[PDB]
Amino acid sequence: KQDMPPVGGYGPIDYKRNLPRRGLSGYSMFAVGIGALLFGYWSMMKWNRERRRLQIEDFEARIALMP
Amino acid sequence: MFMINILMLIIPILLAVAFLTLVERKVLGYMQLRKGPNVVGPYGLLQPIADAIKLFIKEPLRPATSSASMFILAPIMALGLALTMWIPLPMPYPLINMNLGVLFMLAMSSLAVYSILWSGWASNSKYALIGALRAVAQTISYEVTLAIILLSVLLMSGSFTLSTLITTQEQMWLILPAWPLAMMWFISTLAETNRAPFDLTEGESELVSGFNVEYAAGPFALFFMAEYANIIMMNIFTAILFLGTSHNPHMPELYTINFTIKSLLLTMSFLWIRASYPRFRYDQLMHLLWKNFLPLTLALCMWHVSLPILTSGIPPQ
Numbered sequence: 159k160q161d162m163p164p165v166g167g168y169g170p171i172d173y174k175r176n177l178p179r180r181g182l183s184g185y186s187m188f189a190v191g192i193g194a195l196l197f198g199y200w201s202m203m204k205w206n207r208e209r210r211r212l213q214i215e216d217f218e219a220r221i222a223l224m225p
Numbered sequence: 226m227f228m229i230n231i232l233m234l235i236i237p238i239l240l241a242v243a244f245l246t247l248v249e250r251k252v253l254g255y256m257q258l259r260k261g262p263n264v265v266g267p268y269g270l271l272q273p274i275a276d277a278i279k280l281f282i283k284e285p286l287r288p289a290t291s292s293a294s295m296f297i298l299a300p301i302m303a304l305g306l307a308l309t310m311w312i313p314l315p316m317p318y319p320l321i322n323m324n325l326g327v328l329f330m331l332a333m334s335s336l337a338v339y340s341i342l343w344s345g346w347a348s349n350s351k352y353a354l355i356g357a358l359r360a361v362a363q364t365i366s367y368e369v370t371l372a373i374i375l376l377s378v379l380l381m382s383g384s385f386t387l388s389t390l391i392t393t394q395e396q397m398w399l400i401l402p403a404w405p406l407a408m409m410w411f412i413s414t415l416a417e418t419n420r421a422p423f424d425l426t427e428g429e430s431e432l433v434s435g436f437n438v439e440y441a442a443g444p445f446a447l448f449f450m451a452e453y454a455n456i457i458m459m460n461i462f463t464a465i466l467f468l469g470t471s472h473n474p475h476m477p478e479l480y481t482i483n484f485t486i487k488s489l490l491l492t493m494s495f496l497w498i499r500a501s502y503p504r505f506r507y508d509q510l511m512h513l514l515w516k517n518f519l520p521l522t523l524a525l526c527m528w529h530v531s532l533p534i535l536t537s538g539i540p541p542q
């Protein structure tokens with residue numbers, strides 16, 4: 159008279175299938191990308207242009223000597 | 226004391242390829258929910274000094290049907306260019322100040338495939354005869370995916386030296402203005418240096434066929450050794466090019482501290498890719514170079530030609 163099945167206490171667990179979490183898609187991407195990339199080239203032309211100014215100063219000390 | 230500097234660079238890096246083989250599996254182990262080398266270390270840490278001596282005791286046979294002067298010449302050229310490439314590389318001061326050394330990397334990365342063409346031929350038959358011919362074929366095609374987008378940042382750097390490659394990045398961390406090129410920079414070195422997803426080279430390669438298939442543990446001990454010396458060298462080359470650190474002349478000590486921490490992080494990715502993704506089935510490997518990788522690389526090439534002109538932002542040299 160000592161046998162298994164309980165009178166109660168059950169679930170069940172699902173048979174389902176779901177993890178579609180979105181996700182920042184669909185014109186949200188391709189907009190943060192271009193907005194990041196244009197910040198890069200804007201951070202250029204303030205350094206590459208400025209280094210060309212110091213470049214001419216480096217040639218300047220050459221030319222003020224050599225006679 | 227120049228000669229004491231060279232030996233101060235070859236010897237402390239053979240530990241870092243021997244203490245990567247141990248971190249090859251501890252990192253790959255906790256992804257599987259299991260501990261590292263548990264019993265011999267105590268923590269593992271003494272594993273490779275025991276795992277090195279066994280190879281040089283175990284009998285180094287040569288195959289009877291093999292050639293002679295080719296089979297024992299490719300491991301000479303294996304460790305030669307795997308260690309010669311570490312020379313012109315600033316941290317913060319390089320050993321050698323080459324005028325143009327970025328090109329010298331491709332002058333060193335080109336000849337490595339000329340040993341695989343030897344060893345696949347030098348020993349024996351079909352499991353490395355034709356099976357290594359189609360390993361030279363993948364490594365040649367990923368230079369034109371490589372050499373173009375290596376040039377595509379030099380239009381913005383200014384010249385060919387590497388001291389300017391740290392000067393131009395004092396305020397930028399240059400992965401941002403070129404992040405499409407930075408993607409295909411990664412996958413190239415992921416497939417050229419013969420690694421895990423694009424893996425018809427080593428051991429995943431029909432899972433039976435490799436260039437390691439015939440070398441007993443005498444000459445084999447370098448092949449693995451030498452090879453692991455490339456993979457921490459494209460990582461030390463990516464992090465001096467895109468993700469450049471800051472140099473201070475009064476404090477060179479704080480350069481390397483903030484530097485070796487970064488090349489280690491990218492080196493983790495070559496381990497962290499292998500525990501996710503399957504192979505590529507040799508057609509689809511090369512089907513995505515021409516058809517898919519290559520026409521974008523010309524597209525950004527024409528983009529990076531005109532954009533320094535139509536910004537009036539010419540880099541000075």
Ligand SMILES: CCCCCCCCCCCCCCCCCC(=O)OC[C@H](COP(=O)(O)OCCN)OC(=O)CCCCCCCCCCCCCCCCC
Pocket residue numbers: 301322323324325
């Ligand atoms: C199996 C064992 C038997 C084989 C043993 C021999 C194997 C040797 C294989 C080594 C192959 C490496 C060859 C690489 C050549 C490239 C060297 C180079 O270009 O160095 C860069 C530098 C350029 O000059 P620059 O940058 O302007 O200098 C700064 C000036 N302000 O140039 C310089 O700094 C100086 C240039 C002159 C230096 C001497 C010439 C260099 C080459 C000497 C070795 C000859 C090559 C041997 C054949 C190679 C075979 C693979």
Ligand SMILES: CCCCCCCCCCCCCCCCCC(=O)OC[C@H](COP(=O)(O)OCCN)OC(=O)CCCCCCCCCCCCCCCCC
Pocket residue numbers: 192405406407408409411412422498502513517518521
């Ligand atoms: C107008 C202003 C200017 C506009 C600028 C706009 C900028 C846009 C930039 C776009 C260019 C950069 C993107 C590079 C292209 C991606 C490469 C590619 O095309 O892969 C295509 C590949 C082909 O397969 P598919 O077409 O999907 O067909 C099978 C479907 N059943 O399908 C694939 O997806 C393959 C995926 C890669 C294959 C290797 C995967 C192995 C693991 C690699 C992980 C790498 C992770 C990141 C790398 C490190 C990053 C730091």
